[PDB]
Amino acid sequence: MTEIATTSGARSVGLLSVGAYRPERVVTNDEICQHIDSSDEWIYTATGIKTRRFAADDESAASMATEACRRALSNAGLSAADIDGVIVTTNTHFLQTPPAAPMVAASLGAKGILGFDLSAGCAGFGYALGAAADMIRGGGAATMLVVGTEKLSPTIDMYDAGNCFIFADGAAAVVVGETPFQGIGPTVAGSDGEQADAIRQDIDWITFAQNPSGPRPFVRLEGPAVFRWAAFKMGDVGRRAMDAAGVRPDQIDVFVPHQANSRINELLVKNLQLRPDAVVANDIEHTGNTSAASIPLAMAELLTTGAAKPGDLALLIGYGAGLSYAAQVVRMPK
Amino acid sequence: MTEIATTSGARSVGLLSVGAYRPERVVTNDEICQHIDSSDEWIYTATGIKTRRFAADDESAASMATEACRRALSNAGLSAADIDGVIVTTNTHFLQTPPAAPMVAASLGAKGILGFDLSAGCAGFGYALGAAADMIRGGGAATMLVVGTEKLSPTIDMYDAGNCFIFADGAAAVVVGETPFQGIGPTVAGSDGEQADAIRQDIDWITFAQNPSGPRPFVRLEGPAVFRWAAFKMGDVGRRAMDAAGVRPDQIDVFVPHQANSRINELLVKNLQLRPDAVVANDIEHTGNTSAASIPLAMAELLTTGAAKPGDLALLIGYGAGLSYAAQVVRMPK
């Protein structure tokens, strides 16, 4: 006979701001061509990557998230006191525990707010953004920080001519909160665990710890499998995201697919049939593939250069590791 | 002028069932404390732990989660096809990527469903349950699997007399779906990022990998500090959870605090002012502290012994690493 109470928050939520942080060190294609048999021109034409950013030895996924969050808050004209929760989405927090979220919250002056780490491969941002919107509309929070951060450089095998030039470091955060009108569309997501090996850490940490003299872990990438999967299936996920958002393809002002490979994204543009003048994120050129931090970093690049503008309707499509994807239509932040 | 659409789902949701998997191997206190000369009785008197289960070498956080989910599905009279998404909460998936969720979904035959891994230290379950409820009410899924799973045994330092006897292995999943009347109360969560070192892996994986000859990483647990914090703060957390759920202390039929210390749980029962005949979860006796899987495993133990019955009003309070906590009032599942 006892009835559990039901709570609810603001139905209309949106991106109040985006803040980005990219490590200082610039690493050129030729800088890694010392241990690989390819060239600078080959890399660019195959991936679209010219340069990449590597974080300093004293930096981590957590420290870069702190920096990204401070910038997002500043750009939103808010402080941690206005934040009710923080979701850190990453794949490079090199500690089984504790999670990064609490320490990140403390570093902003809000050591006590709720928060957790979200891992869904490269698509962690999409899932995190959706979970934040879900929590806020549900009344569990009013304003949140969602920060994608990655320090992939230490996981790269310089001798792997297959991906040594793909991954990079960086972090970008968005402030999610109430907005006059809906700014975040329904979440469209899924996965394919049958191809979980397409992007992976080859040796688990325990197997390594129980035999420290053997081969150490490194990130491996089966290029052909990822290309075939993403290039041919993300078109349909993108249409599902727009449909769920109740928007037509021609109404999309900006397209921000995961910055995994220029060639894959170029095919997605053709497949999605967006307006000929739609702006497409190409932050991969000098940022490389920063996994979970990829789309928020790309959004920031588009906004700081003027290519994209506040209010623009953007199609976000994250795809990657575990072979999971998350997409949604959103209104670009300020 | 374009209006981003808003979707909606079942307003009332609850735990349809719970499924638990406890590895076969029983490990006595002397077995992990054979490397220390401490009293067998002292461990039980101080923490309430007698034995714990350790997973086999061919098992992992992911494989145990899969089995837990199969059982949860069976107990709810549902099939993998009835599941729209799965959230795996753990702190012992020893791979930076790919995440465990896609793999678990594939293994269950729940092809392509959305999913992700959530790490909030030991309180991952409460956060994941709250996220599942939020996603369902938001219309992003109708029925979900939330599974806590941990394989902490490989991270235990047999020579650490401070925590060698604390952690254990196991997994438990719940099915979250629409229900006639609200079954999941509002989420009450938070943390203390300034005490991130209280429970932690002492050496990050990269530092170790760059010095394989040096010391191996292990999970450290500062008992004094963690229990001091728990005793001091969980009482208020429990009250906020009950208040949010609109229920009085005398209305709770089952109390399911994290299984970390029996004495603390006794202290909380009193502080929370629950009825003397309220059933208190003590699965810790032969399960130990299974971190993220602790609460759902404790719910199952209470239900399989008959101590608790489906429909009973229960108070869940998770707390642990990163110094996170997550609590909510819920109706016990099948």
Side-chain angles (χ1 to χ4, degrees), chain A residues 2 4-6 8 91 94 96-98 111-113 115 117-119 127 182 190-191 194 196 201 205 212 245 251 321 331, chain B residues 2 5-6 11 91 93-94 96-98 111-113 115-117 119 127 182 191-193 196 201 204-205 212 245 321-322 331:
Chain A
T2 310
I4 297 301
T6 294
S8 60
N91 294 284
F94 308 115
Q96 295 302 134
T97 202
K111 69 172 182 174
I113 62 173
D117 291 5
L118 187 321
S119 276
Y127 279 109
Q182 200 62 76
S191 61
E194 303 290 348
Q201 164 173 149
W205 293 121
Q251 289 179 291
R331 191 143 284 148
Chain B
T2 60
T6 304
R11 204 67 191 298
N91 300 282
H93 185 228
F94 307 109
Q96 289 305 314
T97 208
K111 310 306 176 184
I113 67 173
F116 60 80
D117 293 358
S119 297
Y127 275 113
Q182 198 58 268
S191 48
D192 185 340
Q201 163 176 152
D204 77 77
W205 292 124
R331 293 272 183 54

Side-chain angles (χ1 to χ4, degrees), chain A:
Chain A
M1 301 180 268
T2 310
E3 50 197 301
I4 297 301
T6 294
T7 188
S8 60
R11 82 181 76 178
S12 182
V13 300
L15 308 172
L16 299 178
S17 71
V18 63
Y21 180 62
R22 25 255 302 185
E24 192 181 5
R25 183 186 171 197
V26 181
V27 181
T28 60
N29 290 309
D30 290 305
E31 204 170 312
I32 64 90
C33 280
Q34 54 178 297
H35 297 182
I36 298 301
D37 293 304
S38 289
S39 65
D40 173 53
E41 181 179 1
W42 185 76
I43 299 175
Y44 179 63
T45 58
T47 72
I49 303 173
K50 290 180 182 175
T51 63
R52 58 194 58 64
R53 258 83 191 307
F54 274 26
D57 284 350
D58 68 325
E59 299 183 278
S60 62
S63 72
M64 290 193 286
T66 287
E67 189 57 43
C69 287
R70 283 176 180 159
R71 295 184 183 186
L73 269 37
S74 176
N75 292 172
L78 303 172
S79 61
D82 303 298
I83 304 164
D84 308 311
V86 55
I87 299 183
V88 171
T89 183
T90 180
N91 294 284
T92 50
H93 178 60
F94 308 115
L95 242 31
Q96 295 302 134
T97 202
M103 62 183 82
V104 171
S107 70
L108 300 176
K111 69 172 182 174
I113 62 173
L114 68 88
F116 54 85
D117 291 5
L118 187 321
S119 276
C122 317
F125 184 75
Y127 279 109
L129 176 53
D134 287 331
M135 187 180 298
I136 295 173
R137 296 194 186 109
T143 311
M144 293 192 256
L145 266 167
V146 171
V147 55
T149 181
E150 303 281 20
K151 181 173 177 178
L152 285 151
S153 52
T155 71
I156 299 171
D157 169 10
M158 274 299 115
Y159 293 71
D160 190 338
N163 59 38
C164 65
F165 45 84
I166 306 273
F167 305 110
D169 313 336
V174 290
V175 168
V176 185
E178 176 166 28
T179 38
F181 307 82
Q182 200 62 76
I184 300 173
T187 302
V188 164
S191 61
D192 183 354
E194 303 290 348
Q195 307 187 62
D197 296 318
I199 303 176
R200 69 183 189 294
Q201 164 173 149
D202 54 13
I203 303 167
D204 74 77
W205 293 121
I206 295 303
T207 297
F208 176 57
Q210 306 185 318
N211 179 51
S213 63
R216 68 99 105 187
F218 279 123
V219 58
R220 305 302 177 184
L221 172 280
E222 305 307 320
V226 176
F227 176 85
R228 184 219 173 298
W229 173 66
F232 291 105
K233 298 197 172 180
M234 289 308 110
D236 282 353
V237 52
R239 271 179 290 281
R240 286 207 280 134
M242 295 182 283
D243 190 22
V247 301
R248 304 188 307 280
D250 69 274
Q251 289 179 291
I252 293 305
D253 303 304
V254 30
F255 178 39
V256 190
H258 181 77
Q259 299 297 294
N261 179 98
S262 62
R263 177 161 156 57
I264 295 177
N265 292 157
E266 283 173 49
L267 281 167
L268 292 179
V269 171
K270 292 187 174 188
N271 182 288
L272 289 162
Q273 305 190 301
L274 308 175
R275 296 200 307 267
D277 71 338
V279 301
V280 180
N282 181 52
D283 185 35
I284 192 179
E285 186 164 65
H286 296 135
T287 303
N289 186 339
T290 55
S291 293
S294 189
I295 105 139
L297 276 174
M299 291 172 76
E301 185 273 351
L302 288 175
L303 286 165
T304 56
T305 59
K309 296 186 178 301
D312 282 351
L313 197 65
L315 205 207
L316 315 185
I317 299 187
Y319 58 92
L323 248 76
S324 46
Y325 63 82
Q328 60 256 116
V329 172
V330 310
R331 191 143 284 148
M332 291 300 271
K334 302 178 181 178

Side-chain angles (χ1 to χ4, degrees), chain B residues 222-247:
Chain B
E222 302 313 318
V226 171
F227 301 147
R228 191 174 304 142
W229 171 72
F232 186 70
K233 185 151 183 57
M234 292 312 114
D236 288 337
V237 169
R239 273 182 287 283
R240 281 196 291 145
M242 296 189 277
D243 188 50
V247 304

